[PDB]
Design a protein around this nucleic acid. Sequence first.
RNA 1: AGUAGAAACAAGGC
RNA 2: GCCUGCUUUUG
RNA 3: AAUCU
Lengths: 638, 511, 744
Amino acid sequence: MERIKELRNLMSQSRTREILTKTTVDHMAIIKKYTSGRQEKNPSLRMKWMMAMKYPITADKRITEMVPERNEQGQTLWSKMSDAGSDRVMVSPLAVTWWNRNGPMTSTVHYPKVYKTYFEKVERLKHGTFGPVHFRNQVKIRRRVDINPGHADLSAKEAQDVIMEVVFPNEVGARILTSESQLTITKEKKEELQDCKISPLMVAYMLERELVRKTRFLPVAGGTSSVYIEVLHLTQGTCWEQMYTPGGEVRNDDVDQSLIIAARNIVRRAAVSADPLASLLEMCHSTQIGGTRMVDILRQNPTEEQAVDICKAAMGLRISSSFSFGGFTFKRTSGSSIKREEELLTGNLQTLKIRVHDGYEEFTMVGKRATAILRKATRRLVQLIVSGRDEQSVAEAIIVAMVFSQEDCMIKAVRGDLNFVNRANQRLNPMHQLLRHFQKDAKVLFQNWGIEHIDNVMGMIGVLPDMTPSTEMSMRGIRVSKMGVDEYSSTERVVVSIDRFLRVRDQRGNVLLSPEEVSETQGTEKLTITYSSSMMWEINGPESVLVNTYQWIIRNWETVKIQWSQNPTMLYNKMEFEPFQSLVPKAIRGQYSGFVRTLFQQMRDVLGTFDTTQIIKLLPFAAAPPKQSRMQFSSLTV
Amino acid sequence: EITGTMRRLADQSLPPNFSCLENFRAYVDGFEPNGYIEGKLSQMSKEVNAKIEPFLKTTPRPIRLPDGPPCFQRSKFLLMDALKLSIEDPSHEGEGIPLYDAIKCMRTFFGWKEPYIVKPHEKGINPNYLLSWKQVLAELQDIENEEKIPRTKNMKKTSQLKWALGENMAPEKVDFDNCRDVSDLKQYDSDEPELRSLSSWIQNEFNKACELTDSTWIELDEIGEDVAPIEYIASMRRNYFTAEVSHCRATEYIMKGVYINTALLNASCAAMDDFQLIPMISKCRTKEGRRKTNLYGFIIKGRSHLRNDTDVVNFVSMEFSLTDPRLEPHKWEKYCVLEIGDMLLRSAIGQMSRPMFLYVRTNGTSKIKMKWGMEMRRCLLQSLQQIESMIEAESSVKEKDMTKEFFENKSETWPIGESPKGVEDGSIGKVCRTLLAKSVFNSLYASPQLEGFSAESRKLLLVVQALRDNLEPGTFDLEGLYEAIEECLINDPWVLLNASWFNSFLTHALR
Amino acid sequence: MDVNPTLLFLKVPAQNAISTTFPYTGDPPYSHGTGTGYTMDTVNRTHQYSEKGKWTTNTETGAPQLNPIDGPLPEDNEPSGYAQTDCVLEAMAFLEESHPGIFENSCLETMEVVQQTRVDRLTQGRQTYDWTLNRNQPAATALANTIEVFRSNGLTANESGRLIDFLKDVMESMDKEEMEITTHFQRKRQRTIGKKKQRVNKRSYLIRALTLNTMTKDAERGKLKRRAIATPGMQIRGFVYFVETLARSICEKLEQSGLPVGGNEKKAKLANVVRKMMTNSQDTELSFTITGDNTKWNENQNPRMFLAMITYITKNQPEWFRNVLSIAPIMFSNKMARLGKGYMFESKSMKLRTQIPAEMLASIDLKYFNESTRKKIEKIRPLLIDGTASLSPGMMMGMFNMLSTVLGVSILNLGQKRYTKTTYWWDGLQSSDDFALIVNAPNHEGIQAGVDRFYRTCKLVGINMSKKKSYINRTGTFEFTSFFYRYGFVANFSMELPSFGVSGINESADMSIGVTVIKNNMINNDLGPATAQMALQLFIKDYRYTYRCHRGDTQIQTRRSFELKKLWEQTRSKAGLLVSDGGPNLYNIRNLHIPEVCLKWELMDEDYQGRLCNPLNPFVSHKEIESVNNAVVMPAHGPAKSMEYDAVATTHSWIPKRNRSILNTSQRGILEDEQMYQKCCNLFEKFFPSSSYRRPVGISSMVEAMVSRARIDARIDFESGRIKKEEFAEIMKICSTIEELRRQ
RNA sequence: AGUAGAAACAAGGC
RNA sequence: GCCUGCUUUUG
RNA sequence: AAUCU
């Protein structure tokens, strides 16, 4: 009613009429950023200079009917002079404090729900639990980490339409909402923010900060989750760690990830020790994750991974001998396997190293909206049966199985820019990258796989490149079935035994797991893992391990220098050099050991030869059991 | 489609053996390499080279310093030669009318004389400075009889201050078609500055800036209550830091400059046409916990219509001192020095009656220089940051906090200065004060020469470090680097002193 | 004892104390007058280092242009702009040979970008030289005036809203005889403000479209003498946008580049690359590192080599792509340069001063000038055409840094040991005008030979190395863009020192930025906790003194020391007040990551809480999502970056006032245009609220959509809701009158 | 005079 | 008497 | 146990 009158007042004029009539809506975007200049090249100096003068601030003109021209002392609060390219009028910083001591009031109960992120930080610092401070040698590594983790369901393209429907429900257009999480969030935020008058723009900005994800490169030690990165200025320093545990609730992805990493590191050390099982138990007791102890997560949390399974079985629990790949849950049912550490090329000519497995083996793939049975050999697929619901479910299962097969028909079907490193020369994982490449569409992998005949057994359905069943000839090894419900609930955990050297065995006597199946990969925990035995660096990472090993031997030089001469075998077989040995490759440990021990021995034999740097350098390599040899080395790899 | 004009510009935008864009495109499309770089290298002269000049101990020569008349003083206020009158007023930093405090601190001195000149300026008119002092006194008197101190005193615009503040000195701005046939019409003078040689007083100023004192000069804001252990650790670290830092003359100069530049900027924006009297006031807490107010002198601001960041506001500085100007007159080239009184110090010489001088000057400043002197407290961070780094670098090694060991036990020391019999070491607090004074002097004596010298000497510092680390360093043109360093040493005392220090460093290093 | 801080470097290494060598607590050097002299110097320099080439006269501009390409080979170690085509193309060919598919994929990405992007992308950026006014203006203002003159002449393809159509228009505008423009004036005796039409012949329009503006760069850290820089126009902007898009896409796929990555990404990439080199290197092999800068980098580099590169990278692509990427190096090979403000003259006898514009240096007697300037003008006078100098043989500072990095990596890729055909080899890291080389060989003779071959292979392309500023040591220590690597990168903290004060945006924003830089420097740099507490204290002192907001329990008289005391005495809970309202500071390391309103929200009084945080306040202004909590800040050694600060919209979130000098100038009429456009756009946001969150789209006039939505909302709100019949009839009447005003 | 330092300020515009 | 105190600053 | 600017 009042804005249409303003439109009439504008249209009555001549220049403004000419602007309204002869200006399209796509040109409005350009002229709204038209100006003489709005750039300060030193804003600090301008503030210092302007806050020394009267009337440096600007405000709307309706302040003239809300604040008086001057106060009781006679100080003027606003002027009659107007800003340059605006209707706004110049005012002082006294109008502000006048408003804040004598101005109109409102209700501020909606405010902690709009600005939810900020008040969540508040409540999450209030209910936090501090702990001691530990001084030590700290190594930070630079990584991409999340500031805002966002809503895991919305993908950052649905989130903007959600924001549109909540705040601007009539200006959204044709987009209907499809997912159920969208409708849930929409109704929640729509009944919360019902008749607020803060501003739509600020509500939208804050909903974006709530829902969409946001990353940053920073130097990091300890935890990588977002609740631990907002306080990285307080938990981590150059020489000091501060124990801390935020107060809110934690997502379980972080917990299972951190348990997996912790268990991997623990197993990696424990394997090279003399009694692996005792060391493993002592490490699991003396360690905790996000404040909660590790035994609690190990008893409560069901998670599929080899190292977690060894830990659980060592606690006398029932294991799910299983793992994960591409969102599917694999349980081996036949055969052995060994990795090979090999190298190859792609169709786009990028070179890459991978670990290809040995032996014939069968597997029982499982998933959320599919199911499958798989048989394969070294680098070669043997057969695949599928039980998906929709056709694209079978497509997912087939591309996952093809990647899992490690066949050259898949490697030589890679086309386009597929960079196998990050934007900072960081090695991503090859399997995940291939599996991401073939998820846009795997047209070339289907058109290059092959074709076979079929026996037409069971009336089983044929494969589909693009939804075309072929009931007599089809892709090699790939068949299809159909099920309305689950074939079998394979979530049935078994009882096991363990040797000292961490060989898991079923009730019969066969072998199920071993410290060779755990990954050789070095990850970075999402929750801060805290280890309190005597030295707090023996599960922290390779860099810390190196620095702290050499620092320890420096500090204890006074007794190592004399133990090195008399009874040195009791110095090499020492509990401090075991985290180091986990980094030396298993093939060249004893060769290095024999090399170094012969070095030190003939360094003792002839008189007048002593270099403390050599002894401080080569001791962590003489820890291992000695294998003799005849060759020589110019360097030593770690 | 490229057509018309933009084809022609395309044909005239290629190498010289081409006349059409399309023939060039065809040459590119048919390009297969058949060893061209090898040929062009084989043709090129062997005089085009990158021969490696080794860098050894006997290789680096000293940096040559300029020759000329000795260097004078150029700060905006006196550093070591300054005197303060005090009354022991119990008010904090920004509290209280300053003209009233000034009158009160002038009442407490007995010994005023009829002023007369001791050391003239030799390019000015010294009676005008004398008369300006007398005018200041008359105005301080007629303040008292006004029934309320006004916080802002304007002065009368008379011949003395019009001369001393540069009024109607600018030339008039006209059109070139009205000044063509003028004889001496020429370009603004744009020449190499006058060279000036190093003197001994800058090192004594720096030595006194690094000194302890019997008073406190900085009272810090409160912060929150400490809830975590590391907050308490940081708090004891901070107690030590603040103890070392509040007792230092460099902090006194910080507070002085911040006060004066703040005052000048605010008066300059507020009163652009009026002349204004501005006292130099400071606040301390002496050894017994008593607050003290301190008067260093007076400033008279002139007109300050500053349309631009570099435009200059002129002012007249008056400062009290006890230091005779007849012993280092080359330091006081820009000053007239009067004699204003006598003073009886805590005396073993019966009662002393040492004379008392007033150093008078015309100076000038800009908005950006004021802005940067209005925020000198950042210097306190720089120093302290480095100190904590060192501490942390040992705390990582010996897994414990080491602030107490360093600050109390004086175990570890670092070289700080050169004495007869050679290198002398100091404790972490001495290092802190030395770096603080370095930053303060960088802020007070800032010039483009310092920028240049810092960069070009960073390079040589790093190649020397590479020699000490035994990394086989080398160069391609070292005399070019020296000629580039020496290009920036012209006339600034602070920069020449840094160069002298660098030569001493090369002498004590490179061994 | 006489004190020497430099002797500290006798115990602590230079990299672990390099912060002492940065005098960034003092004012930086500034320029005071004209920059004409530095412009002349750069012109005559780049015509000096390319002088043995051949001269020609353009048929379109009439300008003398110097072509040094495929010129003679150098005979000494002085700079040279004598580039060779065959070696550039061989460099590109071997680059594609080593990293196949790089150009194809980059070209496909850039083709998508070319097809989709819009003209509005030119609105966001830095200032831009407007040929319509012969000075610099913001980007959107220049775009708008250019579009206006185009539509006034007949070029209307940009109505499509795409960029490539605007480029077709600017191309089609060159084939016109007489362009027409409009100019601002104003007269006062009564302030009359109007416009006037004028004409521009074809050659005039060409020199105006091809020219760049020049100015001197203030606030430079690290130099005794001032530098000149250039600013390009509106017509060379979309083309260079696409070219730098292509170059970005390429350089992202190269392990040697450093330009598209910032902050810790940069250092991470550098460190990973150094480790990769030291792993591929052998143990019997000797290894050295050159820390190097290039001299006269932007004067030697020629656009014709860039055209060669472009035509090799677009090999086997559609001709429209090849022809829309070939126009930037063309237009930067026929470019010109405005000289600047001019000079000022002085007479002591008559006591007067005068100014001399740069557009009379060809028609002025040289008696006035001094020797250096006389020589400058004497050399440059041939190249003058309508107040702007021809400048073909080189670039200017700050453009084509990506493609120049591509050439640098092309030269670094010629050390793979299958292209040297020998036992020495090399690799390294490159950013525009800075590099780190690493050379491997079994002896020092091979090291010298590799250094020589790098120097010569780089001179065959126009890349000259500064021997005066470069040095070679063993591997482990080097310097790259003021990053000092010593077996690992090292913290400096003095580059970040001018970021520790009041930023000058508003109370809330300055507060948030002040605490946020402290916690950032705690993360990235090595600012300790105690020093951070001190930083808080000092920041709060500066905050209080600047904004005149002291504790309220103090006796410091300011202009608003009375309002704050009244607020203090009204208030019961005093720990809930903000530092801007005269309250305490509850900040510490524990809680640096929380705003000032949520930190103290349970401590506030409800009346204060509702007054402060009120949407009806007249002080707040939020306009668009890309400017809500985002401020431009100006670091040391960089361009003006944008900082994100977490804050709550309060009555302290005010905007400050404007310059107001333009009232006194002929171009005063831009204010009125701005004002009217802002009226119209504000009303549009009243009708269409999403217009500030999502870009509108449509072809109708604004009034049409406005009155239509008025009618619709009226109907829907009368049917079931608030609107009665009287309001309905009245506003429909107003809509009718709006139609009678627009259609007639 | 003074600030400053390769060109300007020492008020400017109508 | 009127108006102004950054109307042109690379990446 | 990861792949989102």
